[PDB]
């Protein structure tokens, strides 16, 4: 379960790619404000790409929540995970990208007995 | 602007539907009588029909009773304006100016 | 509401038929306009002759081939007057113009089926009596459609092959009329007259 939270509305789910992110390979797909005098993305014509702006902000009741309803939290070791014993169905653990496979089984065996949800239990499984 | 001479019915419908008040500015809906009472019991007015009565029977405390009301925020007319072009006079076939009693019709499409 | 709406083109106006036919193609109806060579245009003959000779001068300068194509057939004059309505450069326009079939005369899959008219397109229900009009066979012939007489010959065949049929129908309905006289005065005809039918 989770908290009783309203229906999670995500006003603009599409990613705000840069203008000409596709046409050139040098122009990366990270957003930059167009600043040309002649520019048509700053000037917000019809049929051109939509800009990020504060109107697309998310609801403060359902902000930072995963689609399971828990705020994620990076967990390196067992001592970080036991800071979530009080808060099991509010936060969810997430094991970092540099934890060895001898410690992930320890962290999962602890989070199972503490009921803390891990958002990536399938990382580095020794099948 | 389009102005005219409102009857009792349109004033009553505006103050019951779109009538709000100014309380340290704070545009506040006039849902209860305690708002109008606590804000104009200095002036005799202690219910919403006391406001309507100071409107239509233009009285000694009309200025404060009018300035207590936030300006009305009307819709567009629910039947159209009745004309092809608004910006001629009501005498030439538009909308602006004095339209005396017919203002009631227009306000009952904007309320 | 029919699967195919066959339209007799005789005694209609080119633009006023083309408007309703173009709107019915864009709603999902299959329309075949038969006998397009007896279609009409308002104004006299010479007005429309000099409106076609002012269209016939408009080819490309540098290569006359790739310019505007000046079709001479009456079905193709009607088709040019139609496809300027349907937005034919899309795909919706192409799937609209593939619902249409416009012929000269009535080719023999379509002579056995009933042919409707469009009453807001007739020359007799629109034009004020006295205005001149233009049969499209004359206009197409004087700009170089070669086949008018040939189509006339086939029409001068098919009416005969229809008219005998009409007698072969009509006398039959005569017998049916006698049957509709012999069912009267019974109980069932009076009960049908009680319920309207």
């Amino acid at each position: 379960a989770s908290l009783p939270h309203p229906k999670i509305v995500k006003k603009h789910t599409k990613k705000f790619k840069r203008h000409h992110s596709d046409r050139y390979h040098r122009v990366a797909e990270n957003w930059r404000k167009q600043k040309g005098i002649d520019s048509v993305v700053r000037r917000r014509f019809r049929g051109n790409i939509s800009q990020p702006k504060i109107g697309y902000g998310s609801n403060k009741k359902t902000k930072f929540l995963s689609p399971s309803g828990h705020k994620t939290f990076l967990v390196a070791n067992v001592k970080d995970l036991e800071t979530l014993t009080m808060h099991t169905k509010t936060y969810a653990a997430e094991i970092a990208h540099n934890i060895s496979a001898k410690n992930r089984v320890v962290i999962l065996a602890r989070a199972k007995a503490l009921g803390i949800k891990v958002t990536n239990p399938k990382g580095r499984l020794a099948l | 602007v389009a102005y005219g001479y409102p009857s009792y019915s349109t004033i009553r419908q505006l103050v019951y539907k779109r009538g709000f008040g100014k309380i340290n500015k704070q545009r506040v809906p006039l849902s209860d009588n305690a708002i109008i009472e606590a804000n104009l019991g200095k002036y005799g007015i202690l219910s919403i029909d006391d406001l309507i009565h100071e409107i239509i029977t233009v009285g000694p405390h009309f200025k404060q009773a009018n300035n207590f009301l936030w300006p009305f925020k009307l819709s567009n007319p629910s039947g159209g304006w009745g004309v092809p072009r608004k910006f001629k006079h009501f005498i030439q076939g538009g909308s602006f100016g004095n339209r005396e009693e017919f203002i009631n019709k227009l306000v009952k499409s904007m309320n | 509401v029919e699967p195919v709406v066959v339209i007799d083109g005789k005694g209609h106006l080119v633009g006023r038929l083309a408007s309703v036919v173009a709107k019915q193609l864009l709603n999902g109806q299959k329309i075949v306009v038969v006998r397009a060579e007896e279609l009409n245009i308002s104004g006299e003959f010479f007005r429309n002759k000099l409106k076609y000779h002012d269209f016939l001068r408009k080819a490309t300068a540098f290569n006359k081939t790739r310019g505007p194509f000046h079709f001479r057939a009456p079905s193709r004059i009607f088709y040019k007057a139609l496809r300027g309505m349907v937005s034919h450069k899309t795909a919706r326009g192409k799937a609209a113009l593939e619902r249409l079939k416009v012929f000269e005369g009535i080719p023999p899959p379509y002579d056995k089926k009933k042919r409707v008219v469009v009453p807001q397109a007739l020359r007799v229900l629109r034009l004020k009596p006295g205005r001149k009009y233009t049969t499209l066979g004359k206009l197409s012939t004087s700009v170089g459609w070669k086949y008018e007489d040939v189509v006339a010959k086939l029409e001068a065949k098919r009416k005969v092959s229809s008219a005998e049929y009409y007698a072969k129908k009509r006398a039959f309905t005569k017998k049916v009329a006698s049957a509709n006289a012999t069912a009267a005065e019974s109980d069932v005809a009076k009960q049908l007259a009680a319920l309207g039918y």
Partner: protein, 106 residues
Amino acid sequence: AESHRLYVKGKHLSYQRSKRVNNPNVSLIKIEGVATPQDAQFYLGKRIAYVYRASKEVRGSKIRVMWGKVTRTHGNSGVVRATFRNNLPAKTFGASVRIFLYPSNI
């Protein structure tokens, strides 16, 4: 009996539009046999289904249905603004569609 049809057949038309915009959320329906808005006041609220065939057979069948309802009338010639659950795919402009007789007013 050769007929089982409990639906009025209608034709999908264009989206809600200006000359130059179009609003894909509200589709236009041309109901057969309806010519006036006073006649089209009957079909308000009645449920429309578009029915189309597909390639991959899911749920034991190849025929997939999109549902929706009539919302309001449109024009003086009996066009009907209707919304759907997922909007009609802008390729069905001229496709038949089924205005059912439920929710029944009568």
